[PDB]
UniProtKB/Swiss-Prot annotation, chains A, B:
The name this protein goes by in its record: Transthyretin
Other observations noted: Tetramer dissociation and partial unfolding leads to the formation of aggregates and amyloid fibrils. Small molecules that occupy at least one of the thyroid hormone binding sites stabilize the tetramer, and thereby stabilize the native state and protect against misfolding and the formation of amyloid fibrils.
Compartment annotation: Secreted; Cytoplasm
Annotated phenotype, changing residue 42 to I: In AMYLD1; amyloid cardiomyopathy
Residue positions, PTM Sulfocysteine: 2
Covered range of the whole protein: 29 to 145 of 147
Amino acid sequence: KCPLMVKVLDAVRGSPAINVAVHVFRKAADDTWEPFASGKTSESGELHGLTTEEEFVEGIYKVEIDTKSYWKALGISPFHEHAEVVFTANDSGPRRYTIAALLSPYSYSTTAVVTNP
Amino acid sequence: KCPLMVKVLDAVRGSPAINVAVHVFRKAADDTWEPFASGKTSESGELHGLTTEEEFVEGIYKVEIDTKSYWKALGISPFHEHAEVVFTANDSGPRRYTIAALLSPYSYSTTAVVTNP
Amino acid sequence: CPLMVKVLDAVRGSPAINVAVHVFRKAADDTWEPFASGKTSESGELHGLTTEEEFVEGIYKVEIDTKSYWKALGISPFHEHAEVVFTANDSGPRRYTIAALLSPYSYSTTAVVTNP
Amino acid sequence: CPLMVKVLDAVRGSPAINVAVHVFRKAADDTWEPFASGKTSESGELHGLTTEEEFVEGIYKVEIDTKSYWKALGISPFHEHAEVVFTANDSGPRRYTIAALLSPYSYSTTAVVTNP
């Protein structure tokens, strides 16, 4: 269905962070990152449809959020090159992962919400 | 419609914070807080239906989240008595307010997302 | 120092300077009584609010005037202030650091609690 | 100190002690080269990673081993580590404080950047 979704918020303007590039990678057996999925956040700051239950197998995944380009479009010079979230997906009942990021120019936070539908 | 909604997340368990009491107050002319609306967060950690466009007039509002009771039910002793969010509602186009809080035992964060539907 | 406040600015990547802070203690009649006040320094810190002798058991409120801070920078922020409410010293004297990280539409606050 | 790391624990309200930190610098061939490493002290801080002379312009990565920290406390956390990637010293020498606030399913990181 939709086992992985990303949401990005802008703490300076109190708004969804729209049109932010997100790249997802999976760790391959040789220890390198393979492209897995990508997209841009919508009007609501969300990115859906990255993958499906069948393809999203147990493994280590990296979600990269292009925060620098977002701030530069606003005319604000930011600190980070990008924000990176690295985690292991574990089967253990049916799981859905929501990765949220809250952005400021010199600070971000990220939270995972993991639920069973 | 639904111009004010509250969402609460648990950073320790990576889950919605369920069954958390929330009280909303409005500042009255004599500078005291009058009860305005209340409820408990749902399974998804959200609280909807607090008020309507007609009643939600410009003013200063306080949202109180009973965080202490939440942690005590989990067996964790927390720092704060509650979390409080105080803000002015301003008419300026149609506005919807989402107040989010992310809870840990010794730390919380709160963010406002303000959008036009 | 039994009670110290530290405030950072997440937009500029700097300490938040000249931020007004007011501290209250809940009195017997359930009212907030003024306890101490001050402004953050160039390092974003506020020291010297109280002493160990005066800082007795109780419920305290630390109010940080975030709105005035952002307005002076030309930004119209969401919150009127940030308030932190906590019980202090109920298992004996501790040292409290209250940190706040500020953005115009969001803030976080953390307590670090040490046993002398 | 040109580069300092500070790590706090939001579950316990304390500094995060004995946290491994590794720093890398992007080399000419676009690989991450090891630059410095260490562990946080009893105050949650890591000092002495580098010097002004060695800390030249570049893209740096600070990796904080959050997973090992939580596991030693009996908690199975979400993230493998926290990584902070930034360009340093491109308008001249600055001093950098990288702070991280940790919870098992969430973290925040802030930079405070000062001009000597």
